[PDB]
């Protein structure tokens, strides 16, 4: 992707990518080797991409793949990654070496907000029990043992993958957060010609149709926002808490009880209200990228496009009354179709309803 923005076209870059895929080592375990199908790219969990438009991630869902084929591919890619080996490794390290946290961090991380740990009697899930102060110590030890990296965890992961695949056990893929079919109509151009002269024709066409982005208008990940809120107000929340963990535990519970949740994580009010607001307005970003580890994804070509509030009214038409998070998620869903169409120099407007349902009836707005 970062190559395509500079000196490389879709034809050359895609040929290079396919040849790179063809030579990958494959999952090696014991004296057996698994080479999975190359159709895992369009599957959920991997960047779901169409070959002619590789920039748009998570676009493979809308492709007319057979439902059964797509389901089996999703289970395959879900089973290709497991978290059991790391848990087993950490558990055995704890059972063999014991506690590793200092006493200063033991006494410093204590409940201060003076709130009943039982809560309102609500169901305390596993993550909440992990992050709650009275059970902090064990959790802290896990962090230490999550630091250590060694060959054996990945050899065990490969062995588990091989056994599970061959035995017929496919992990059940998680559901998709957002999915909607958007129906397009013609419209006019909005953008300005691309300064990237060397870039491929598709990217320049997208720049001409939609426009270019800027750092002021660039969207911010919810995890980074929660991290900023936590860091700007030290002492309000325990230092070990990260934006990812709070976002996950909030995404587990219904929003109606979210406040109670932040009371059990010992989050003082200045951080609590801001975290609640961020979760309310920006849960779509976390739910969209929940199942994919985006640590190694810096989509430069996708970032150059202007997908923000400045271009939503001119290209997306949603009339239903929805919450802000769902509205933004569906706006990105429509933007995916808009970008795919605009790669070919055609500017379109997305709508949530077909123009001609029946041979006699025609719909508007």
């Amino acid at each position: 992707m970062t190559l395509m923005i500079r000196y490389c076209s879709v034809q050359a870059c895609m040929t290079q990518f396919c040849n790179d895929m063809k030579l990958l080592n494959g999952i090696r375990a014991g004296n057996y080797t698994f080479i999975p199908t190359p159709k895992i790219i369009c599957a959920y969990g991997t960047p779901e991409i169409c070959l002619r438009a590789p920039e748009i991630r998570s676009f493979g869902r809308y492709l007319p793949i057979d439902e059964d084929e797509y389901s089996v591919l999703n289970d395959l890619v879900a089973s290709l990654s497991t978290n059991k080996p790391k848990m087993d490794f950490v558990a055995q390290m704890f059972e063999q070496n014991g506690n590793q946290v200092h006493g200063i961090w033991l006494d410093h991380f204590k409940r201060k907000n003076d709130v009943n740990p039982d809560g309102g009697g609500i169901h305390i899930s596993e993550g909440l029990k992990r992050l709650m102060p009275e059970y902090c110590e064990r959790h802290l030890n896990e962090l230490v043992y999550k630091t250590l990296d060694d060959k054996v965890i990945r050899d065990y992961t490969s062995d588990i993958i091989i056994t599970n695949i061959c035995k017929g056990k496919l992990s059940k893929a998680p559901k998709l957060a957002f999915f909607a079919n958007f129906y397009l109509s013609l419209t006019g151009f909005n953008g300005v010609d691309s300064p990237y002269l060397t870039a491929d024709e598709g990217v320049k066409n997208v720049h001409r149709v939609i426009g270019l982005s800027y750092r002021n208008t660039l969207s911010t990940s919810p995890t980074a926002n929660v991290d900023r809120i936590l860091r700007n107000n030290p002492g309000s929340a325990p230092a070990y808490l990260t934006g990812n963990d709070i976002l996950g535990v909030l995404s587990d519970y219904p929003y109606q009880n979210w406040r109670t949740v932040v009371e059990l994580l010992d989050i003082t009010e200045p951080s609590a209200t801001a975290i609640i607001e961020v979760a309310t307005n920006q849960m779509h970003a976390y739910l969209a990228d929940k199942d994919l580890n985006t640590a190694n994804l810096f989509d430069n070509t996708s970032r150059t496009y202007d997908i923000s509030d400045r271009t939503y009214p001119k290209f997306v038409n949603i009339t239903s009354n929805l919450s802000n998070s769902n509205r933004r998620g569906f706006q990105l869903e429509a933007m995916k179709h808009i970008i795919y169409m605009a790669r070919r120099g055609i500017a379109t407007l997305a709508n949530t309803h077909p123009s001609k349902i029946g041979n006699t009836v025609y719909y508007d707005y």
Binding site: N31, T33, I35, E69
Partner: protein, 121 residues
Amino acid sequence: DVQEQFEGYLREEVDLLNKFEDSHFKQLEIFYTKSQTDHVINKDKLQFNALPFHTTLYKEINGKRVRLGTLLNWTKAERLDTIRHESMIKDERLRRLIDFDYGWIDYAVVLQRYLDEGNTI
């Protein structure tokens, strides 16, 4: 008529995906020999042995089969001497390459075809 064009483009995407997967399997058919068995993930029963050197793992769902991938069992490495082996290597230059590390064996035999084309470096 933009919607129909969009649907046609998605259908072309599916066709390209199928061609790309087929090309990948055909290309991997030369590094290891042609697949010897088609092992069904759920329907068939295997005890992790008596599986050939190269197998195609499929999965059956709703009266249809999909192609999960390929399994290679390195115990039955004899099949690999069908394509690459020291017997075919004859030219004195590549014997030392074979002895240095066996990993070049494949490339070595490929080079020999060039040498059997009559051209010498």
